[PDB]
From Swiss-Prot:
Family per record: Belongs to the integrin beta chain family.
Sequence positions bearing Phosphotyrosine: Y39, Y51
Miscellaneous comment: The constitutive activation of ITGAV:ITGB3 on neoplastic cells may contribute to tumor growth and metastatic potential.
Topological domains, Cytoplasmic: 8-54
Subunit: Heterodimer of an alpha and a beta subunit. Beta-3 (ITGB3) associates with either alpha-IIb (ITGA2B) or alpha-V (ITGAV). Isoform Beta-3C interacts with FLNB. Interacts with COMP. Interacts with PDIA6 following platelet stimulation. Interacts with SYK; upon activation by ITGB3 promotes platelet adhesion. Interacts with MYO10. Interacts with DAB2. Interacts with FERMT2. Interacts with EMP2; regulates the levels of the heterodimer ITGA5:ITGB3 integrin expression on the plasma membrane. Integrin ITGAV:ITGB3 interacts with FBLN5 (via N-terminus). ITGAV:ITGB3 interacts with CCN3. (Microbial infection) Integrin ITGAV:ITGB3 interacts with herpes virus 8/HHV-8 glycoprotein B.
Disease named in the record: Glanzmann thrombasthenia 2: A form of Glanzmann thrombasthenia, a disorder characterized by failure of platelet aggregation, absent or diminished clot retraction, and mucocutaneous bleeding of mild-to-moderate severity. Glanzmann thrombasthenia has been classified into clinical types I and II. In type I, platelets show absence of glycoprotein IIb-IIIa complexes at their surface and lack fibrinogen and clot retraction capability.
Protein purpose: Integrin alpha-V/beta-3 (ITGAV:ITGB3) is a receptor for cytotactin, fibronectin, laminin, matrix metalloproteinase-2, osteopontin, osteomodulin, prothrombin, thrombospondin, vitronectin and von Willebrand factor. Integrin alpha-IIb/beta-3 (ITGA2B:ITGB3) is a receptor for fibronectin, fibrinogen, plasminogen, prothrombin, thrombospondin and vitronectin. Integrins alpha-IIb/beta-3 and alpha-V/beta-3 recognize the sequence R-G-D in a wide array of ligands. Integrin alpha-IIb/beta-3 recognizes the sequence H-H-L-G-G-G-A-K-Q-A-G-D-V in fibrinogen gamma chain. (Microbial infection) Integrin ITGAV:ITGB3 acts as a receptor for Herpes virus 8/HHV-8.
Reported modifications of this chain: Phosphorylated on tyrosine residues in response to thrombin-induced platelet aggregation. Probably involved in outside-in signaling. A peptide (AA 740-762) is capable of binding GRB2 only when both Tyr-39 and Tyr-51 are phosphorylated. Phosphorylation of Thr-45 inhibits SHC binding.
Tissue: Isoform beta-3A and isoform beta-3C are widely expressed. Isoform beta-3A is specifically expressed in osteoblast cells; isoform beta-3C is specifically expressed in prostate and testis.
Gene transcribed to yield this protein: ITGB3
Motif placement: LIR: 43-49
Protein name: Integrin beta-3
Length: 54
């Protein structure tokens, strides 16, 4: 039951306050466009062209 093992990690991470602190930090650093979803969308597009049907 690999799912059970993963769940355990979530508990440990959730317990770590540092994890929550990082979450808010990411949102704060969302001022740039590179960290904006649009940036990721553009990357995925290139992946397709740089590697289509092949």
């Amino acid at each position: 039951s690999p799912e059970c093992l993963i769940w355990k990690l979530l508990i440990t991470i959730h317990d770590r306050k540092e994890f929550a602190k990082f979450e808010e930090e990411r949102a704060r650093a969302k001022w740039d466009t590179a960290n904006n979803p649009l940036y990721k969308e553009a990357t995925s597009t290139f992946t397709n062209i740089t590697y289509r049907g092949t």
